[PDB]
Amino acid sequence: MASKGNVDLVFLFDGSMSLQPDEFQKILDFMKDVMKKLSNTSYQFAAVQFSTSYKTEFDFSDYVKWKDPDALLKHVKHMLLLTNTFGAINYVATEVFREELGARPDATKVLIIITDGEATDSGNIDAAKDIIRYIIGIGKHFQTKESQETLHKFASKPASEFVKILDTFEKLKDLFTELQKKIYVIEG
Template identity: 50%
Template sequence: MSASGGVGVIGVIAALMAALPHSGAFNIHPAPYRVLTHSGSSSFGHQVLRLQDDRLLVGAPVGPGGRLFSCHVEHGDCREVELDANVTRTNLGMALTHWGRDVIACGPGWSRPCDRNVQTSGICVLIGQELRPIRSLQPGYQGCQRGLVDLVFLFDGSSSMSPAQFGAIRDFMVDVMEKLENSSIRFAAVQFSSDIQPCFSLADYAAWPRPRDLLKGLMQLGGLTDTFTAIKYVVHQTFSEAAGSRPGARRVLIIVTDGDATDSDTGGVRDAEERDVIRYVIGIGHNFNSPDTARLLEPIRLGRRIRAGAGRIRAPPGAVPRAPGQDLRHRRHE
């Protein structure tokens, strides 16, 4: 650039500066910042809400529990807001907001037992100007919906069952009932072979829910395997209000057997369908590998209400299965 050109640019800049209004320069001196901390909570500061009088409401929703702190900005001190002990276990302080002159603090972790499960929902606390809880709020609260279930074990006690298999069935029933003893499930047990032997009813279990006592002295019946006759008995007798069945309860029938039935269906399966009895079959022994056995069991376990197929419990070593398709009406039982 030429010298004359440079002088011209400088002149233009000088003219513009002269035309601008005069202003004074100043320096910015910010006030010292304040760090607010609390050693007792790693989540301190997850949510912050400004209050009156230079105060802050600080949420610490995670470990231990849910806590709120009132912090004075000028002094730099924080004190914990006193809350109900049950509320502090709900991750309170996950959300903070104003409600007029008051404050609402919320947390999502309100857990409570419900029929052997844990039900979780949110809970909020309305806090007044003096930072004292006014009342709890329960948005979207849903009470414990207990699913009533009447469950009947119909188990095989025919002569084709080995003593080890029969003992395994008893242990299985006891284990299931003990694990679900604090639930809304009510149990009953019926042994079948050529005969039918009710072990205990739904009402018996409701009066004394001690499965080991209820099955004490259980002996194997022996005989044939009249499965369909037993199903009809359970549908009409065991699942009756007189025997302790509850109106509105879901009815579940668990059939434990080692294979082929020795009788024919005379309407028991149809009656189970009409009464919405959900049926499961648990097979014991090697006979369940037979296509013929699977075909014969289809009417028992299938239907519009069925939600599961047949299961299998392995037979103990040395158990002798029945021959597939064998007509047990003509078999000698010892």
């Protein structure tokens, strides 16, 4: 079912050159908020910073072990490169979503992509077709309709649900609240 309690939430969060320190700190804050509020074993979190490259900040096992976002995020070094969303999605799909790294099979396979930038790679994401690509398009490069439309290709379906155009990092708090409202029903 959807509301099976168990959730593997991968934050595939962008730290491209496009993001500036404060903005990126708000990206951190957002993840940190979810993690704080949902500090329980039901919700396993992982976070992959990405740009040109993908960078596992921490995995499900790490979360399970430490259960503190501030600790878990200590690894964050802002990369400031391109935005290889597709390669990072494939990486996540194959490498991050593993039992050995703490991905319980019965967990809801949630991949929350946080990006202000279009997918500079645009290779494939078939590897992740079954994984829930939730995507937050910050209205910097997703200000443009043409750019927004790309999100709906990356995202899981219905894209209407899974894509959130987010005019500014400022609204991460509002978005967070909305996501909590929904995710509450998944936790039950």
